[PDB]
């Protein structure tokens, strides 16, 4: 039984870091960012503009999604990432976490949810995930991250 | 007698707001944001840089830009604003040239700029187009219903 929680607790910053570290898609610098967002929500609240949906089983965090409203826009949101622990990864939890983010974005009047990823081979699964969830590749910024590493911007119309 | 400066002084937060106010293009809250960025630089480092254009004791214009997080050599041009008495005199292009020079010197590769596709932003669009930027992406209805975001790309090296 997976439970979805939106309230950020003090235990979360480190639990998120461990989730992020278990996936292999986060360099230490990226895992630092992942944890910092949880801490800023603890040191401010909703004010930081970072929202979370944590998937838990017992006292363990199976995975989570991080998202927020896009600055200077009306009804546009960014999905920062969905991270699931390796042992809960072929469980449909990723799609469940995205469904919850979409529910939340719809409730606050959102029209769009954007996700950005890399165009390299390693990110092929992530792109499939987004495409299977109904996101459409709307923009490609060539060599955005580095030579040969393009940024692909995926769009999901929510309303 | 135009000079270029990059050290953020306490006095600049208000001068920048005034450059933004002088144009008559932005809301008082948009001017608030511009002033806030200058102030946030003074208190930090904060991820962005400035190039101020000045004629005598007055700020004629400025540019605000910074490195794109999580990229190697990608930069974002946040804002370039020139006062009405500096408009159409090439100060905007000159400020953009300074940003591009500073970005190239830090080993930068790309400079992106973003604007709206609404009627009011046509001059901004033309300015970037005239400067060598190419429209690489359009995210439809991005800022609000019917207001698309155009992402402009400038290869600097």
Walk me through what this model shows.
- 2 copies of one chain form a homodimer.
- By secondary structure, the first copy, chain A, is α+β, with helices and mostly antiparallel strands.
- Chain A has a single domain (1-159), classed as 3-Layer(aba) Sandwich (Aminopeptidase), CATH 3.40.630.30.
- Chain A has 4 helices and 7 strands.
- A 7-stranded mixed sheet of chain A has the order 1-2-3-4-5-7-6, sandwiched between helices.
- The first copy, chain A, is globular.
- The interface between A and B is medium-sized, with 22 and 21 residues.
- It is classed as transferase.
- The entry lists the keywords putative acetyltransferase of the gnat family, jcsg.
- It forms a dimeric assembly.
Give the secondary structure arrangement, pairings included:
The structure is a homodimer.
Chain A: E1 3-5, H1 12-23, H2 28-43, E2 51-57, E3 60-69, E4 76-84, H3 93-107, E5 112-118, H4 124-132, E6 136-146, E7 149-157
Parallel strand pairs in A: 4-5
Antiparallel strand pairs in A: 1-2, 2-3, 3-4, 5-7, 6-7
Helix pairs in contact in A: 1-2
Protein name (chain B): GCN5-related N-acetyltransferase
GO molecular function (chain B): acyltransferase activity, transferring groups other than amino-acyl groups
Keywords (chain B): Transferase
């Amino acid at each position: 039984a997976v439970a979805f929680r939106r309230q950020v607790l003090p235990q979360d910053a480190l639990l998120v870091r461990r989730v992020v570290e278990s996936t292999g898609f986060f360099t230490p610098e990226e895992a630092d960012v992942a944890q910092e967002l949880v801490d800023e929500h603890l040191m401010h609240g909703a004010a930081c503009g970072y929202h979370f949906v944590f998937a838990t089983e017992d006292d363990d965090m199976a995975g989570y999604a991080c998202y927020g409203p896009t600055p200077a826009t009306e009804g546009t949101y960014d999905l920062y990432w969905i991270a699931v622990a390796p042992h809960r990864q072929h469980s449909g939890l990723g799609r469940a976490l995205l469904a919850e983010v979409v529910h939340d974005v719809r409730l606050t009047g959102g029209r769009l949810l954007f996700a950005e990823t890399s165009g390299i081979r390693k990110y092929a699964p992530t792109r499939r995930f987004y495409e299977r969830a109904g996101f459409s590749a709307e923009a490609v910024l060539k060599a955005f991250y580095r030579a040969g590493d393009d940024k692909i911007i995926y769009r999901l119309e929510v309303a």
